[PDB]
Amino acid sequence: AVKYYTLEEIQKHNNSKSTWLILHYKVYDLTKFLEEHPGGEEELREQAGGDATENFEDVGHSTDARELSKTFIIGELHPDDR
Ligand code: HEM
Known part of the structure:
Protein backbone atom coordinates (compact mmCIF):
# COMPACT_ATOMS: atom_id res chain seq x y z
CA ALA A 1 0.00 0.00 0.00
CA VAL A 2 0.96 3.68 -0.18
CA LYS A 3 0.18 6.56 2.16
CA TYR A 4 -0.69 9.91 0.58
CA TYR A 5 -0.25 13.27 2.27
CA THR A 6 -1.65 16.63 1.19
CA LEU A 7 0.38 19.83 0.93
CA GLU A 8 -1.75 21.17 3.79
CA GLU A 9 -0.62 18.48 6.19
CA ILE A 10 2.99 18.47 5.01
CA GLN A 11 3.45 22.21 5.68
CA LYS A 12 2.75 21.61 9.37
CA HIS A 13 6.00 19.66 9.74
CA ASN A 14 8.46 22.53 9.89
CA ASN A 15 9.32 23.00 13.56
CA SER A 16 11.91 21.84 16.09
CA LYS A 17 10.40 18.39 16.48
CA SER A 18 9.46 17.47 12.92
CA THR A 19 10.98 18.29 9.53
CA TRP A 20 9.33 16.94 6.38
CA LEU A 21 9.90 17.92 2.78
CA ILE A 22 8.95 16.79 -0.71
CA LEU A 23 11.30 15.47 -3.39
CA HIS A 24 9.92 14.20 -6.70
CA TYR A 25 6.41 13.74 -5.25
CA LYS A 26 7.71 11.63 -2.38
CA VAL A 27 7.50 12.78 1.24
CA TYR A 28 10.61 12.47 3.43
CA ASP A 29 10.82 12.76 7.21
CA LEU A 30 14.33 14.18 7.75
CA THR A 31 13.90 15.02 11.43
CA LYS A 32 16.71 12.69 12.55
CA PHE A 33 18.91 13.35 9.51
CA LEU A 34 19.33 17.10 10.07
CA GLU A 35 22.54 16.79 12.11
CA GLU A 36 24.07 14.14 9.84
CA HIS A 37 23.46 15.89 6.51
CA PRO A 38 26.86 16.75 4.93
CA GLY A 39 25.35 19.90 3.45
CA GLY A 40 24.31 21.24 6.84
CA GLU A 41 20.95 21.48 8.57
CA GLU A 42 20.07 25.03 7.52
CA GLU A 43 19.60 23.98 3.89
CA LEU A 44 17.02 21.44 5.04
CA ARG A 45 15.19 23.60 7.60
CA GLU A 46 14.67 26.40 5.07
CA PRO A 79 -2.42 13.02 -6.57
CA ASP A 80 -4.88 15.91 -6.24
CA ASP A 81 -2.06 18.27 -5.18
CA ARG A 82 0.33 17.37 -8.00
C1 HEM B 1 16.71 13.50 0.88
C2 HEM B 1 17.65 13.95 1.78
C3 HEM B 1 18.96 14.26 1.43
C4 HEM B 1 20.01 13.43 1.56
C5 HEM B 1 19.94 11.94 1.89
C6 HEM B 1 21.20 14.23 1.33
C7 HEM B 1 22.49 13.72 1.39
C8 HEM B 1 23.62 14.48 1.10
C9 HEM B 1 24.94 13.92 0.97
C10 HEM B 1 25.30 12.46 1.17
C11 HEM B 1 25.77 14.93 0.58
C12 HEM B 1 27.26 14.78 0.27
C13 HEM B 1 27.60 14.92 -1.21
C14 HEM B 1 26.79 13.99 -2.08
O1 HEM B 1 26.82 12.77 -1.83
O2 HEM B 1 26.12 14.48 -3.02
C15 HEM B 1 24.95 16.13 0.50
C16 HEM B 1 25.43 17.40 0.22
C17 HEM B 1 24.64 18.54 0.10
N1 HEM B 1 23.26 18.58 0.21
FE1 HEM B 1 22.07 17.06 0.64
N2 HEM B 1 20.88 15.54 1.02
C18 HEM B 1 19.49 15.56 1.07
C19 HEM B 1 18.70 16.68 0.83
C20 HEM B 1 19.18 17.95 0.51
C21 HEM B 1 18.32 19.07 0.20
C22 HEM B 1 16.78 19.03 0.14
C23 HEM B 1 19.13 20.15 -0.01
C24 HEM B 1 18.78 21.45 -0.35
C25 HEM B 1 17.52 22.06 -0.31
C26 HEM B 1 20.50 19.66 0.17
C27 HEM B 1 21.64 20.43 -0.02
C28 HEM B 1 22.93 19.91 0.01
C29 HEM B 1 24.13 20.71 -0.16
C30 HEM B 1 24.20 22.22 -0.29
C31 HEM B 1 25.18 19.87 -0.12
C32 HEM B 1 26.64 20.29 -0.25
C33 HEM B 1 27.17 20.05 -1.64
C34 HEM B 1 28.54 20.67 -1.85
O3 HEM B 1 29.46 20.37 -1.07
O4 HEM B 1 28.70 21.46 -2.81
N3 HEM B 1 20.53 18.30 0.45
N4 HEM B 1 23.61 15.83 0.78
Whole structure:
Protein backbone atom coordinates (compact mmCIF):
# COMPACT_ATOMS: atom_id res chain seq x y z
CA ALA A 1 0.00 0.00 0.00
CA VAL A 2 0.96 3.68 -0.18
CA LYS A 3 0.18 6.56 2.16
CA TYR A 4 -0.69 9.91 0.58
CA TYR A 5 -0.25 13.27 2.27
CA THR A 6 -1.65 16.63 1.19
CA LEU A 7 0.38 19.83 0.93
CA GLU A 8 -1.75 21.17 3.79
CA GLU A 9 -0.62 18.48 6.19
CA ILE A 10 2.99 18.47 5.01
CA GLN A 11 3.45 22.21 5.68
CA LYS A 12 2.75 21.61 9.37
CA HIS A 13 6.00 19.66 9.74
CA ASN A 14 8.46 22.53 9.89
CA ASN A 15 9.32 23.00 13.56
CA SER A 16 11.91 21.84 16.09
CA LYS A 17 10.40 18.39 16.48
CA SER A 18 9.46 17.47 12.92
CA THR A 19 10.98 18.29 9.53
CA TRP A 20 9.33 16.94 6.38
CA LEU A 21 9.90 17.92 2.78
CA ILE A 22 8.95 16.79 -0.71
CA LEU A 23 11.30 15.47 -3.39
CA HIS A 24 9.92 14.20 -6.70
CA TYR A 25 6.41 13.74 -5.25
CA LYS A 26 7.71 11.63 -2.38
CA VAL A 27 7.50 12.78 1.24
CA TYR A 28 10.61 12.47 3.43
CA ASP A 29 10.82 12.76 7.21
CA LEU A 30 14.33 14.18 7.75
CA THR A 31 13.90 15.02 11.43
CA LYS A 32 16.71 12.69 12.55
CA PHE A 33 18.91 13.35 9.51
CA LEU A 34 19.33 17.10 10.07
CA GLU A 35 22.54 16.79 12.11
CA GLU A 36 24.07 14.14 9.84
CA HIS A 37 23.46 15.89 6.51
CA PRO A 38 26.86 16.75 4.93
CA GLY A 39 25.35 19.90 3.45
CA GLY A 40 24.31 21.24 6.84
CA GLU A 41 20.95 21.48 8.57
CA GLU A 42 20.07 25.03 7.52
CA GLU A 43 19.60 23.98 3.89
CA LEU A 44 17.02 21.44 5.04
CA ARG A 45 15.19 23.60 7.60
CA GLU A 46 14.67 26.40 5.07
CA GLN A 47 12.86 23.99 2.74
CA ALA A 48 10.91 22.14 5.44
CA GLY A 49 7.18 21.81 4.82
CA GLY A 50 7.42 22.16 1.06
CA ASP A 51 8.82 20.92 -2.23
CA ALA A 52 12.63 21.06 -2.38
CA THR A 53 13.07 19.08 -5.60
CA GLU A 54 14.69 21.88 -7.62
CA ASN A 55 17.11 22.78 -4.82
CA PHE A 56 17.97 19.11 -4.36
CA GLU A 57 18.75 18.67 -8.06
CA ASP A 58 20.42 22.07 -8.39
CA VAL A 59 23.17 20.95 -6.01
CA GLY A 60 23.46 17.63 -7.84
CA HIS A 61 23.41 14.87 -5.21
CA SER A 62 25.43 11.70 -5.79
CA THR A 63 24.03 8.22 -6.37
CA ASP A 64 24.94 7.28 -2.80
CA ALA A 65 23.03 10.25 -1.39
CA ARG A 66 19.99 9.29 -3.45
CA GLU A 67 20.12 5.67 -2.31
CA LEU A 68 20.30 6.79 1.31
CA SER A 69 17.39 9.23 0.94
CA LYS A 70 15.07 6.29 0.27
CA THR A 71 15.30 5.23 3.91
CA PHE A 72 13.47 8.42 4.93
CA ILE A 73 10.44 8.11 2.66
CA ILE A 74 7.15 7.98 4.59
CA GLY A 75 4.72 8.34 1.71
CA GLU A 76 3.80 10.34 -1.40
CA LEU A 77 2.11 13.61 -2.30
CA HIS A 78 -1.64 13.19 -2.81
CA PRO A 79 -2.42 13.02 -6.57
CA ASP A 80 -4.88 15.91 -6.24
CA ASP A 81 -2.06 18.27 -5.18
CA ARG A 82 0.33 17.37 -8.00
C1 HEM B 1 16.71 13.50 0.88
C2 HEM B 1 17.65 13.95 1.78
C3 HEM B 1 18.96 14.26 1.43
C4 HEM B 1 20.01 13.43 1.56
C5 HEM B 1 19.94 11.94 1.89
C6 HEM B 1 21.20 14.23 1.33
C7 HEM B 1 22.49 13.72 1.39
C8 HEM B 1 23.62 14.48 1.10
C9 HEM B 1 24.94 13.92 0.97
C10 HEM B 1 25.30 12.46 1.17
C11 HEM B 1 25.77 14.93 0.58
C12 HEM B 1 27.26 14.78 0.27
C13 HEM B 1 27.60 14.92 -1.21
C14 HEM B 1 26.79 13.99 -2.08
O1 HEM B 1 26.82 12.77 -1.83
O2 HEM B 1 26.12 14.48 -3.02
C15 HEM B 1 24.95 16.13 0.50
C16 HEM B 1 25.43 17.40 0.22
C17 HEM B 1 24.64 18.54 0.10
N1 HEM B 1 23.26 18.58 0.21
FE1 HEM B 1 22.07 17.06 0.64
N2 HEM B 1 20.88 15.54 1.02
C18 HEM B 1 19.49 15.56 1.07
C19 HEM B 1 18.70 16.68 0.83
C20 HEM B 1 19.18 17.95 0.51
C21 HEM B 1 18.32 19.07 0.20
C22 HEM B 1 16.78 19.03 0.14
C23 HEM B 1 19.13 20.15 -0.01
C24 HEM B 1 18.78 21.45 -0.35
C25 HEM B 1 17.52 22.06 -0.31
C26 HEM B 1 20.50 19.66 0.17
C27 HEM B 1 21.64 20.43 -0.02
C28 HEM B 1 22.93 19.91 0.01
C29 HEM B 1 24.13 20.71 -0.16
C30 HEM B 1 24.20 22.22 -0.29
C31 HEM B 1 25.18 19.87 -0.12
C32 HEM B 1 26.64 20.29 -0.25
C33 HEM B 1 27.17 20.05 -1.64
C34 HEM B 1 28.54 20.67 -1.85
O3 HEM B 1 29.46 20.37 -1.07
O4 HEM B 1 28.70 21.46 -2.81
N3 HEM B 1 20.53 18.30 0.45
N4 HEM B 1 23.61 15.83 0.78
